[PDB]
Design a protein around this nucleic acid. Structure first.
Ligand SMILES: [K+]
Ligand SMILES: [K+]
Ligand SMILES: [K+]
Ligand SMILES: [K+]
Ligand SMILES: [K+]
Ligand SMILES: [K+]
Ligand SMILES: [K+]
Ligand SMILES: [Mg+2]
Ligand SMILES: [Mg+2]
Ligand SMILES: [Mg+2]
Ligand SMILES: [Mg+2]
Ligand SMILES: [Mg+2]
Lengths: 130, 191, 177, 111, 205, 243
RNA sequence: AUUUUUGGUAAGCAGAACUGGCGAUGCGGGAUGAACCGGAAGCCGGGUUACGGUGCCAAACUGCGCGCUAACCUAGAUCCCACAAAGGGUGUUGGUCGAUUAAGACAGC
RNA sequence: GGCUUGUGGCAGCCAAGCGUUCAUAGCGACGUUGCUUUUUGAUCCUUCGAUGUCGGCUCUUCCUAUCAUUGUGAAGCAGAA
RNA sequence: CGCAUGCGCCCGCCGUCCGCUUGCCGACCCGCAGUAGGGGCCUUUGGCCCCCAAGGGCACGUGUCGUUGGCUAAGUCAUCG
């Protein structure tokens, strides 16, 4: 049970606030409510656990490591690629891509989806009649 | 103050098979099957197996629990221990008749599942008590005026004994002087 | 970075007179939401403890004190005296935070919650950064673990913002630790 | 696939008439409170600021060969934090319009 | 609570494991805004404080009666659906035409009677017990309280709900088989359309 | 101030309102609980109050002063001619209670029973159940009747028969309009209940098929009417002083 | 009516000092109210506030945060205000001063 | 009727003592905290272009600070009381 | 459930007209249970993966509520037996 724990080196997703969608690394624990997080593109600061969603990724680091050490550990663990390839991480990227689509792109996607739906319906009907 | 981690573990004898799922504990042994529903406890039940040896252990822990919440870990462990004892050795409760003038007449019904008391303090009323599931009551032969209750579930056997005891309470008299009744005198294991 | 409570060093003295050409200079470390309120409390303490009023006193300097390294966790001890409904008492408390300002805010919040003591009824006697081995409270000592590990027992479910909030959902939330 | 019979293009969003700007004990019917579908924050209201709105309803008699009537309005300013807006119409909306739907168009456009 | 703001003919809500008061407030606002609401499985509504406290509260309510003419009210309904209806009425100006019209847009049922057994049922996150009540705190089911205070249709509801759940399980198994067939059809059709799959790829979850 | 002396209140509040009954025939408000391990059997019957007499008997009651002694007791004679069963009604268990599902009637109905469906039988054309009867003459009609009975077996939870008295046999009564009532069938399965009801269509059920000597029973009916009455006689309040 | 204050056990009692208020005054808040809080006013449009509020009634978050409480007595829920005391609790939560303890603290063997 | 509760009535707290010994089975001096408006007072807010002024009789309902009846704990409760 | 009126009444189809509406504009969508867990693959006692809101999916969704004529495999929607 409890597949995920808050740990030194645990990678978490910010699920609320202005920093939503960013990956951070838990480098220390202040108390039961907040921890010390870090990432390559921010300053190590505290965050409440209520704004963090633990991921399945973990890196091997000591508490409050240097920026270079943290970056090296993240690169060795390939955190970015692992998160992006996972369905959970791909979900946010796909949501952003859908939000970014323009009118002509939306029309082309509609055409492609209609054609695929028609072909799939024909295929399924043939399978059923088989 | 919300202790981070309170944990206790117990050893499981090799002769007992145990399953845990959604805080539902199944206990198996030579004497039969016992079940318990621990869903009311907000604890994490885990079964640990040692591959090299094969012995079982049950670990119950509470995360950020208070004293009131943490007090239930040992309760659950003791309940599991009682289940194991009942499924391997069983439980045997002994009751003794106490009377000053009127001897207490006990009549065990068919199947050793019910008992009749007729002459409690010279009363013409017949007292009926039905044994709980898995518990049988027999009249002891080697000890004079002794009832033996045997079963797999400690709680059911003890509750049957309590029912027998409470069915024979003295009323409208000084109970300090009128000591008549049926009382639990020994708690032990069948095996 | 905004703190509700700021730490100030206020320096003041009594007005020079013929008898005292160079009166004694007094300094205090005070906590207040603003420098104006810090100066007010400085004059309150000077009047109550040294017999120097604001009317016959001089304000010399006031500077804010900032945490040296707000990027690291520290253990903070606070010695304070507070007033209850029936008298005055002394109290020592410990906190963990990146800055002493956060620890003081926690202290005010905890006094309010546990003892129903309002802010104006609390006087701070001493503050200090305590090493891990010298901490006295089990609450702070429980996180002095090289390998600290626990699951998120209580997590509140909400959308990233109210933009995605909906009254109705097709399925119930799926929660696990 | 559907075989529906109705408007083939929708260039507006719907708005529910919540009521009037009011206190606990006073009401100001010159201003109407409108909830726009899909708008959940006052930040989102910025897009609809100044957009025209129409309150379409049916009358018993025929006007210009139609039972339909229309009172025009527009979005004035956000109301609260949850996306409600304050709207002004050429004439005060009747109280019976509460719970009815208005059409919020995409013009005048700024894109 | 401003309101959902959606435009739909009606909304069906599965009230199972929803706090009574919060669900009632949300639905009262929805009804006042002009929505039509159907609530099902009212017997599964949760009330905080436990069975004992709620039973004492209901007995206190039962004490209230016009001394000279008990038939003049208050009326003490026992069924879970009527309890939910009265709780909602308590949050609506029901003595005005607006409040009466809002009340007339609400339907409450025990269990899932037809045709709502084959209609998608939604939930209210803001009133869900899993989000509002900490595990370990006392709560009771509305159906249990109703049965304790004189509702005698709990067993019939249980039997009918079991039958409906069996039928729904059969339908779900059929739908799963159909879904597997559809995935097979999609795999078969994959090779037929290259460019369409290419355009669709960056959007698929 | 508190009443000077205490006495129990006059009359019972459990028989409120003291209005005229909405019916003339006694209504069975609760039937005996059904035990499916027993044979199918009727639960009620209709009779007519004939009169009263008294009897003498030797009492067998050990410990009583009347033991082996004669006692005189008043009795009531109720005439109970056999009832004719003419239909079956099945109800379905629902969250709102029992709901009537369907009614099946017999092919032939006596004039006495049909009189119950008219206010002026002589002046009417007497068309009741004429088209319903024809369902027994066509093959599809009998098939439909059997299908209705099968549905009753499949979905009903309690089964009641429709029975009417042979009122014209009591010439002392000046009534040709028979009384019709629903009598619940207890015992057996639902299919057994339906078969038992159907087999009795257009057949007589004697009173001894329901009750037997020494059995304790309940009697339901409307009391004697007395019209507008004052409080002293209506409720039993005491009279005020002479002056 | 705040404060000062006399008689009276006390009183929505009776009598004085300063100031303000009601009376003569609507309006927002305190559910409701002559005196409390805010604030005083020609008929209107727009903007912003005071006191007070933002789960529904009912305009404004089931907003972002920390602790405490679980009431098997109708838990509790906002100046005037529509009351509660002395004594208690091995309920739970913080603090203060003492004593024993790895030359081994307390309970059972 | 309204405010108040001096007075009336009904409870609690401490424990010097009583109770063959024993403060607390049962009581509670010296003190001290309360509750109630079925006492009587205090006041004069409503009613003097009028609210029918004692008591009894009849009738209903309500309260508990429970006399009896149901179920219980304690005793200086052997039984009975 | 029975019976339902001889310039009458009732049912179905077609043309037209009027009136009411709880407010049409894609007015599309049936798993159960649980939240200190659930599910799938592989089956070492085991390993891997998913969840982390319908934030999804479906739908010619494309034409003046949608121009003139003809063909029309399969698919889908509607109407009628
Ligand atoms: K009286
Ligand atoms: K009399
Ligand atoms: K008094
Ligand atoms: K007077
Ligand atoms: K007068
Ligand atoms: K008298
Ligand atoms: K089309
Ligand atoms: Mg009396
Ligand atoms: Mg003021
Ligand atoms: Mg203005
Ligand atoms: Mg003694
Ligand atoms: Mg009492």
């Amino acid at each position: 049970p409890f597949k995920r724990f808050v740990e030194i080196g645990r990678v978490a997703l910010v699920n609320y606030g202005k920093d939503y969608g960013k990956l951070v690394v838990i480098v220390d624990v202040i108390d039961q409510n907040r921890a010390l997080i870090d990432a390559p593109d921010m300053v190590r600061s505290q965050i409440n656990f209520k704004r963090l969603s633990l991921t399945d990724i973990k890196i091997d680091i000591k508490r409050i490591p240097k920026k270079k050490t943290l970056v090296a550990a993240m690169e060795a663990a390939d955190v970015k690629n692992k998160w992006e390839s996972s369905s959970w991480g791909r979900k946010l990227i796909v949501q952003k891509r859908r939000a970014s689509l323009n009118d002509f792109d939306r029309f082309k996607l509609m055409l492609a989806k209609i054609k695929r739906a028609g072909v799939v319906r024909q295929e399924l009907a043939k399978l059923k009649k088989e | 103050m919300k202790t981070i981690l309170s944990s206790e573990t117990m050893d499981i004898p090799d002769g007992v098979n145990i399953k845990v799922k959604a805080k539902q504990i199944e206990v198996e042994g030579p004497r039969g099957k016992l079940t318990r529903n621990f869903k009311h406890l907000n604890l994490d039940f885990q079964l640990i197996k040692d591959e090299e040896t094969g012995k079982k252990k049950l670990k119950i822990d509470a995360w950020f629990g208070s004293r009131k919440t943490t007090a239930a870990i040992r309760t659950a462990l003791s309940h599991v221990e009682n289940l194991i004892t009942g499924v391997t050795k069983g439980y045997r409760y002994k009751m003794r008749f106490v009377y000053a003038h009127f001897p207490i007449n006990a009549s065990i019904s068919g199947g050793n599942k019910a008992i009749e008391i007729r002459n409690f303090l010279g009363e013409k009323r017949v007292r009926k008590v039905d044994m709980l599931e898995g518990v049988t009551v027999v009249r002891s032969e080697k000890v004079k005026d002794e009832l033996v209750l045997d079963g797999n579930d400690i709680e059911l056997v003890s509750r049957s004994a309590a029912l027998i005891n409470q069915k024979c309470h003295v009323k409208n008299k000084d109970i300090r002087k009128f000591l008549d009744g049926i009382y639990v005198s020994e708690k032990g294991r069948i095996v | 970075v905004t703190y509700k409570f700021h730490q100030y060093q206020v320096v003041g003295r009594a007005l020079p007179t013929e008898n005292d050409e160079h009166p004694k200079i007094y300094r205090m470390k005070l906590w207040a939401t603003n420098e104006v309120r810090a100066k007010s409390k400085f004059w309150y303490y000077l009047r109550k403890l040294k017999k120097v009023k604001k009317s016959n006193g001089q304000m010399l300097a006031i500077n804010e004190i900032f945490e040296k390294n707000p990027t690291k966790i520290k253990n903070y001890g606070i010695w304070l005296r507070y007033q209850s409904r029936t008298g005055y008492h002394n109290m020592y408390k410990e906190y963990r935070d990146t800055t002493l300002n956060g620890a003081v805010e926690q202290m005010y919040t905890e006094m309010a919650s546990r003892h129903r003591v309002r802010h104006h009824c609390i006087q701070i006697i001493k503050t200090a950064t305590i090493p891990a081995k010298l901490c006295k409270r089990e609450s702070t000592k429980q996180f002095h673990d090289s390998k600290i590990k626990f699951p998120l027992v209580f997590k509140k479910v909400r959308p990233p913002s109210r933009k995605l909030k909906t009254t109705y959902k097709a399925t119930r939330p799926n929660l696990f630790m | 696939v559907k075989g529906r019979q109705g408007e083939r293009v929708r260039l507006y969003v719907r708005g529910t008439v919540l009521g009037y700007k009011r206190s606990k004990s006073n009401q100001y019917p010159s201003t109407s409170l409108i909830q726009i579908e899909g708008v959940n924050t006052k930040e989102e209201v910025d897009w609809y600021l100044g957009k025209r709105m129409a309150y379409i309803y049916k009358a018993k008699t025929k006007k210009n060969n139609s039972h339909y009537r229309c009172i025009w309005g527009k979005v004035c300013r956000p109301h609260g934090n949850s996306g409600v807006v304050r709207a002004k119409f050429k004439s005060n909306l009747p109280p019976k319009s509460m719970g009815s739907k208005v059409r919020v168009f995409m013009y005048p456009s700024n894109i | 609570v401003s309101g959902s703001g959606i435009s739909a003919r009606r909304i069906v809500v599965d009230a199972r494991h929803h706090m009574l008061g919060r669900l009632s407030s949300i639905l009262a606002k929805e009804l006042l805004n002009g929505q039509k609401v159907v609530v099902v499985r009212c017997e599964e509504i949760c009330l905080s404080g436990g069975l004992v406290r709620q039973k004492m509260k209901y007995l206190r309510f039962l004490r209230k009666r016009m001394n000279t003419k008990p038939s003049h009210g208050p009326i003490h309904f026992r069924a879970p659906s009527k309890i939910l209806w009265r709780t909602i009425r308590g949050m609506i100006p029901h003595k005005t035409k607006r409040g009466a019209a809002a009340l007339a847009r609400l339907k409450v049922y025990e269990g899932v009677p037809p045709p709502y057994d084959k209609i998608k049922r939604m939930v209210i996150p803001d009133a869900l017990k899993v989000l509002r009540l900490q595990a370990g705190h006392k709560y009771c089911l509305l159906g249990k309280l109703s049965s304790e205070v004189g509702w005698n249709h709990y067993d019939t509801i249980k039997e009918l709900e079991n039958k409906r759940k069996e039928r729904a399980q059969v339908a779900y198994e059929r739908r799963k088989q159909l879904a597997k067939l559809r995935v097979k059809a999609e795999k078969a059709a994959e090779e037929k359309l290259g460019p369409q799959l290419a355009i669709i790829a960056p959007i698929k979850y | 101030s508190h009443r000077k002396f205490e006495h129990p209140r006059h009359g019972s509040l459990g028989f409120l309102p003291r209005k005229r009954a909405a019916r003339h025939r006694g209504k069975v408000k609760a039937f005996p609980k059904d035990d499916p391990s027993k044979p199918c059997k009727l639960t009620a019957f209709l009779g007519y109050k004939a009169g009263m007499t008294h009897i003498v008997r030797d009492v067998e009651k050990p410990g009583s002063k009347l033991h082996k002694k004669e006692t005189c007791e008043a009795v009531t004679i109720i005439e109970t001619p056999p009832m004719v069963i003419v239909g079956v009604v099945g109800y379905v268990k629902t969250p709102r209670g029992l709901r009537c599902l369907n009614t099946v009637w017999a092919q032939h109905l006596s004039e006495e029973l049909k009189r119950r469906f008219y206010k002026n039988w002589c002046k009417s054309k007497k068309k009741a159940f004429l088209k319903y009867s024809k369902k027994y003459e066509t093959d599809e009609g009998k098939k439909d009747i059997q299908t209705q009975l099968e549905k009753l077996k499949k979905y009903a939870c309690v089964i009641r028969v429709l029975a009417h008295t042979q009122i014209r046999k009591m010439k002392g009564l000046k009534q040709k309009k028979a009384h019709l009532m629903e009598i619940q069938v207890n015992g057996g399965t639902i299919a057994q209940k339906v078969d038992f009801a159907y087999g009795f269509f257009e057949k007589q059920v004697p009173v001894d098929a329901v009750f037997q000597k020494d059995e304790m029973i309940d009697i339901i009916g409307v009391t004697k009417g007395k019209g507008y009455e004052g409080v002293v006689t209506r409720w039993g309040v005491t009279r005020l002083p002479r002056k």
